[PDB]
Design a protein around this ligand. Structure first.
Ligand SMILES: CO[C@@H]1O[C@@H](C)[C@@H](O)[C@@H](O)[C@@H]1O
Ligand SMILES: CO[C@@H]1O[C@@H](C)[C@@H](O)[C@@H](O)[C@@H]1O
Ligand SMILES: CO[C@@H]1O[C@@H](C)[C@@H](O)[C@@H](O)[C@@H]1O
Ligand SMILES: CO[C@@H]1O[C@@H](C)[C@@H](O)[C@@H](O)[C@@H]1O
Ligand SMILES: CO[C@@H]1O[C@@H](C)[C@@H](O)[C@@H](O)[C@@H]1O
Ligand SMILES: CO[C@@H]1O[C@@H](C)[C@@H](O)[C@@H](O)[C@@H]1O
Lengths: 344, 346
């Protein structure tokens, strides 16, 4: 068997006090510690997830009655271990996926379906040849339709912005305040509606002290926000999502604890105390959260990431509860392995 | 501060029962979880270590009175996150470094220094365009001078061999027995002297059950060896090295515990019980061990890898003891970060 810390739970079927003996799955055609991007349709009618396969291609999992896997970027287009982040607007007929080339330049994949089209192509961002820090992660928001903002870590480790819209093409945007940890995960959201202008932007990242911090944009410029977590694991994965709950934006910020369990902090008329959403230890690796608002004004959340041993998980917050059944999305060949809990 | 499990020790200055509050170093120009290759000179006169920088280049650290850092492969030569393994013979004037291209093909870097040379160049292996499983690790041994064997994981997850020597060029070699874990770390050693023929080859890897296992080559062919660890962490780093102790090959095999502490098994007139060499938790990431025999008959060991938070460590076994001073080799810009030991999630 493989050995696992006895005090941690590897799966939903692990014993209540930790792992004793169980079977878990190794999906070896998923890149170990793959990045993830995702977007659930604002209607909730379908789901999109993107990930990196072991062969380096970027693939897509789409749920529409059932999960279907496809390849969107051939092997060689993306850095091995590229970050990923996605945009969806129109309200839901135009998709952009951002990633890094093997030369650490920002890249954009475009999928247009407006008016029955089905066009997939390399976006104009590629031609700006924007070199980033080689360990940079990626965030992005959209507003007013096709006004786009891409967030990255520059070669001097500051967080940087690239902008698109209003006929200007891609141009360098703001240099953000704060002192980001080199290689920090980053996640940016827009609290205002996809077709609204101006946006209301929040980004989440880890500072050089290890704390978690917040970027704020409102009319008037960029500011460091009130969201402060004094200590977090080194290079903890971070992902945030926002959707209106009872007509007010509900920000969900997720990161990993020292036990590699998912911690959630909610902003909705103020910040709520952080809370562990479940006590199952995921693989310390990228997570991706997305959300939508139902007809009665409640907000659903999905989180994608890597579970033991190398499985694409989907955690579901629906009708006000985290579902104890954690879904898995098969992306290729798999082998089952016995896992035994071992103490120090 | 950054949070670290309270029951683990992040460095040698951590408190005795685990981490309380301390300062640690993040070297951010070292690729996080870099691969490592290494070789100490058989005379012990100098050390070589290879690693991947954050920008994807492959760099070398060379100790000869002091550490000197150089770049040996420019950005774009290697897969980001490439495995690394090195050979040294002549007894110590010919170096080869194996890595993967961004297209998952075996690549070879050559450094020849015999007779005053300083020649660095791409090897003939590159032109063979050998495609490997994209998560393949790499091992290698040499014998009879320039007879070379490179070990990798094929697309069907079996361990495979490529051969060089005897005027034949690079050719496909054996398919090895056993059922290797996809993406297993692998480490191969030659128990016989560099100029001797036949060799005596041992390889260490992790199986689909999670156990650790051993490949054996002697005259007659390959077989599965008697070294068995029934359970180990998923995709645990593995590194082995061998050097003669009292005219008998002494194999050291290293892997990580669930606490990410380094475990050692020795083979020297039989396998000894596995034992933790120290209780400091390294980053769960590639390690590289090398060894040589002093002219008094005793075997020194060096181990390189990633320590908290991201620094290149050197652990030293010298004159029969693991030295308490665990060195760090700076490879670029660094920032100090405060680390606090934390018991629960919140
Ligand atoms: C029409 O241009 C395409 O769509 C825009 C919204 C941008 O994503 C641009 O980079 C892309 O090439
Ligand atoms: C109006 O200002 C522009 O758009 C805002 C939404 C921000 O992206 C800002 O950095 C940018 O300069
Ligand atoms: C007004 O406060 C700002 O906006 C809120 C929605 C939060 O993002 C808060 O952390 C931030 O400082
Ligand atoms: C002279 O040839 C060089 O040395 C041999 C030992 C091999 O490493 C070969 O691939 C390399 O090109
Ligand atoms: C003589 O046989 C060749 O040399 C041995 C040392 C092994 O490398 C074997 O796989 C190879 O076929
Ligand atoms: C003869 O036995 C073989 O050689 C020994 C040196 C060990 O490597 C052992 O595990 C292996 O089975």
């Amino acid at each position: 068997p493989v050995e696992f810390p006895k005090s941690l739970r590897a799966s939903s079927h692990s014993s209540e006090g930790g792992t004793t003996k169980e079977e878990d799955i190794y999906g070896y055609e998923l890149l170990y510690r793959s990045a993830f991007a995702s977007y659930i349709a604002p209607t909730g009618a379908w789901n999109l997830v993107w990930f990196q396969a072991a062969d380096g291609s970027i693939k897509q999992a789409r749920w529409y009655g059932e999960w279907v896997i496809s390849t969107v970027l051939a092997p060689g287009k993306a850095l091995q271990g590229t970050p990923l982040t996605a945009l969806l607007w129109g309200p839901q007929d135009t998709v952009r996926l951002y990633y890094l080339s093997p030369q650490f330049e920002l890249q954009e994949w475009c999928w247009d379906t407006k008016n029955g089209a089905d066009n997939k192509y390399d976006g104009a961002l590629n031609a700006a040849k924007v070199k980033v820090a080689p360990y940079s992660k990626l965030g992005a928001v959209s507003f007013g339709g096709a006004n786009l903002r891409v967030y990255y870590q520059g070669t001097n480790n500051k967080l940087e912005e690239y902008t698109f819209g209003g006929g200007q093409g891609w141009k360098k945007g703001a240099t953000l305040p704060g002192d980001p940890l080199p290689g920090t995960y980053i996640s940016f959201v827009n609290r205002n509606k996809w077709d609204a202008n101006p946006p209301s932007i929040r980004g989440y990242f880890q500072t050089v002290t290890g704390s978690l911090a917040e970027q704020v944009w409102e009319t008037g410029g960029w500011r460091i926000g009130q969201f402060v977590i004094p200590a977090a694991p080194f290079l903890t994965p971070i992902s945030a999502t926002v959707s209106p709950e009872k007509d007010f934006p509900k920000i969900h910020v997720y990161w990993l604890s020292v036990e590699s369990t998912i911690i959630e902090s909610v902003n909705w008329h103020g910040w709520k105390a952080p809370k562990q959403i479940d006590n199952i230890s995921v693989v310390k690796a990228d997570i991706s959260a997305t959300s939508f608002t139902r007809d009665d004004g409640t907000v659903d959340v999905r989180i994608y990431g890597t579970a033991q041993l190398n499985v694409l998980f989907e955690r579901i917050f629906r009708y006000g509860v985290w579902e104890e059944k954690i879904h898995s999305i098969s992306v290729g060949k798999e082998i089952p392995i016995e896992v035994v809990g071992v103490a120090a």
